[PDB]
């Protein structure tokens, strides 16, 4: 009758991931890399990508890494919500559109996948990507 339910996951990226197909980490030149979000202000255009690598058990019973995925989070949100903009950390890269305000984006926050689908991550036409990334 009463089907169990856990605490909600409220911490997902609003956007789909950028999959790393090659050997190069994600990186963006200064001023590039913030995904398109038409429901945001110029003040809002700042955050980080965080690498996540999924592992699966192969046929041999041994663990294999899949292609790394890089997920975008607005500044002050997500798994590294505490970090100030530009805090270097392995697996983190920082991006900001010129004019963004260096303040946490609590008014955007993160996504509950049970309630909202991810937005396809789109970048402005002309954005530079490293080899191994496509958008």
Author numbering: 39 to 173
What does the paper say about this structure?
While the S, M, and E proteins mainly contribute to the outer shell structure of the virus particle, the N protein forms the viral capsid by packaging the viral RNA genome into a helical ribonucleoprotein (RNP) complex. The SARS-CoV-2 N protein consists of 419 amino acids and comprises two structural domains: the N-terminal domain (N-NTD; residues 49–174) and the C-terminal domain (N-CTD; residues 247–364). These two domains are connected by a highly flexible linker region (residues 175–246), and at either end of these domains are intrinsically disordered regions, namely the N-arm (at the N-terminus; residues 1–48) and the C-tail (at the C-terminus; residues 365–419). While the N protein interacts with RNA through the N-NTD, the N-CTD is involved in the self-dimerization of full-length N protein and RNA binding.
Our crystallization efforts resulted in a high-resolution (1.55 Å) structure of the N-NTD with a small part of the N-arm in complex with ssDNA. The crystallization of only the N-terminal part of the full-length N protein, after an extended period, led us to hypothesize that the full-length N protein might have been digested in the crystallization condition, with only the N-terminal part crystallizing under the given condition. Overall, we solved the crystal structure of the N protein from residues 39 to 173, covering part of the flexible N-arm and the entire N-NTD. The N-NTD resembles a right-handed fist, containing a core of four-stranded antiparallel ß-sheets (ß1-ß5-ß2-ß6), which is sandwiched between two loops, a short 310 helix (η), and a protruding ß-hairpin (ß3 and ß4) between ß2 and ß5. Our crystal structure revealed that the N-NTD, along with part of the flexible N-arm, arranges in a specific pattern where the N-arm extends to neighboring molecules and anchors between two molecules through significant hydrogen bonding. In our structure, we were able to model a small segment (TTT) of the T-20 ssDNA based on well-defined electron density. The Watson–Crick face of ssDNA interacts with the protein through direct and water-mediated hydrogen bonds as well as π–π stacking. The 2-carbonyl group forms a hydrogen bond with the mainchain amino proton of S51, the N3 atom forms a hydrogen bond with the sidechain –OH group of Y111, and the 4-carbonyl group forms a water-mediated hydrogen bond with the guanidino group of R88. T0 also stacks with Y109 through π–π stacking. Residues R88, Y111, Y109, and R149 are involved in interactions with both DNA and RNA.
